[PDB]
Amino acid sequence: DAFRLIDTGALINNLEPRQTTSNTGLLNKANIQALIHGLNRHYYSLNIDYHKTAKETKMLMNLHKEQWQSGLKMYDYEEKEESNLAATKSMVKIAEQYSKRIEEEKELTEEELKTRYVGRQDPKKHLSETADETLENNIVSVLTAGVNSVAIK
């Protein structure tokens, strides 16, 4: 954050609205009571923006010379079998959680039902999330192996 003093004699002359003229009126704050007193009432704050050219944007955005060639970098298959095993096991347990939730939860007042029959801590949402996550990873793993076998030899 940036600050610049407004003089004490300047506050007596009540020139503070002069410093907020022709601005968007957006200013910054930091914690209350002692921090904020000094902030607005003894110095003046203006926001900070960040300046760059298109030459510098390219310099930052670049990475390794094998970072645009990292999709051929398959992983060890011991690790990928770890991934296959963990996902299937865990989803059995959240499925069990999902069975209990839909036994009841059919009286009135949704929030009540969701509190009673675990519907909060939503297993319905959790189960779908895990399945999608592992599902996207495995389409590319299959795609990686099918490329590297046929392309190199």
Partner: peptide, 24 residues
């Protein structure tokens, strides 16, 4: 194999759930 064993459980879970859906 571990995966194939866990899979017979996971499919099993879904069949039970589909019955619960049917009632709703």
């Amino acid at each position: 194999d571990a995966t194939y064993d866990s899979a017979l459980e996971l499919v099993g879970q879904l069949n039970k759930v589909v019955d619960q859906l049917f009632e709703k």
